[PDB]
């Protein structure tokens, strides 16, 4: 209301708007590179999925359906994969995924099953540490365009815990890239059910020179690993899109606040000039 502090406020909010526009355009660039990486990685999973379809079609014996093919009965312990942005300002994406993880944990505890969560990205790790349930395995400081080696550190741990019986079922929650405006979480399983990509449309009997057991033992870890990679990369694209949208909204809000503060400053200036002129006129009289 002093006509000078309001000028400082306008300057600060204008700086906020400018830095936010910078954030928006850089985030748009990152979102586009991430979408390009998603497209480039798509063919590998696109091929492995029908491989899983055919292998699942061939392997029907429950006894020979070992490793990740054991639909173990009397579920006790389940593991979940949560992927979060490394940094904030992502909008409501982190709130959505963390709420989804929380309701997942509550539902699993309702069934009496112990749960364990591995966190991708610092925000998930910090949230789960603050809740009081320490994650077993964490992989933070993940790059914008991560390599599959980065996700191996959690994937191999999860599958080792799966094989040893420590965990019975494996799930993953990630920010699905529905559209550049909406990025909702999506739950997926990592216990290959029937590979419903194209069901069993293809029917060609293959020879397993390593052997059925060896083939499945080698391929299923790879399939779950590429599924995790796809989820993480989709989540990165969703993160960049959500940050871009959040910064666009923040810039618009900053400009609206600039307009409001300019109106207030103008009113303050007019009032100050009126007080000035009235006082000098009264002093004249």
């Amino acid at each position: 209301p002093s006509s000078r502090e309001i000028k400082r406020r306008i300057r600060s909010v204008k700086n906020v708007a400018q830095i936010t526009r910078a954030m928006e355009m850089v985030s748009a660039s990152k979102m586009r590179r991430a979408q390009r990486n998603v497209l480039a990685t798509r063919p590998y999973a696109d091929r492995m999925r029908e491989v899983m379809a055919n292998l699942t079609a061939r392997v029907v014996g429950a006894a020979r359906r070992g490793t990740l093919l054991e639909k173990r009965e009397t579920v006790k312990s389940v593991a979940l994969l949560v992927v979060t942005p490394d940094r904030g300002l992502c909008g409501s994406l982190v709130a959505n995924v963390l709420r989804r993880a929380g309701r997942f944990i509550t539902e699993q505890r309702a069934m009496g099953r112990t749960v364990d969560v591995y966190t991708f990205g610092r925000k998930g790790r910090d949230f789960f540490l603050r809740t009081g349930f320490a994650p077993a395995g964490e992989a933070t400081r993940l790059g914008d365009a991560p390599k599959l080696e980065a996700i191996l550190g959690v994937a191999i741990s999860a599958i080792n815990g799966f094989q040893s019986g420590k965990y019975d079922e494996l799930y993953i929650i990630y920010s699905e890239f529905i559209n550049t405006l909406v990025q909702r979480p999506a739950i997926k399983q990592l216990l290959p059910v029937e590979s419903p990509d194209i069901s069993t449309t293809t029917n060609v009997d293959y020879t397993y020179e390593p052997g059925e057991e060896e083939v499945l033992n080698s391929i299923l870890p790879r399939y779950v690993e590429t599924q995790i990679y796809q989820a993480v990369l989709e989540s990165i694209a969703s993160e960049h899109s959500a940050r871009m949208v959040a910064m666009r909204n923040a810039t618009n809000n900053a400009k609206d606040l600039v307009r409001d503060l300019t109106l207030s400053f103008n009113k303050a200036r007019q009032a100050a000039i009126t007080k000035e002129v009235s006082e000098i006129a009264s002093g004249a009289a």
């Binding site: 400018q18 830095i19 910078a22």
Partner: peptide, 11 residues
Amino acid sequence: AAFAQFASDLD
């Protein structure tokens, strides 16, 4: 002008 401290990290 807002990208002087971000000039390298751009198109």
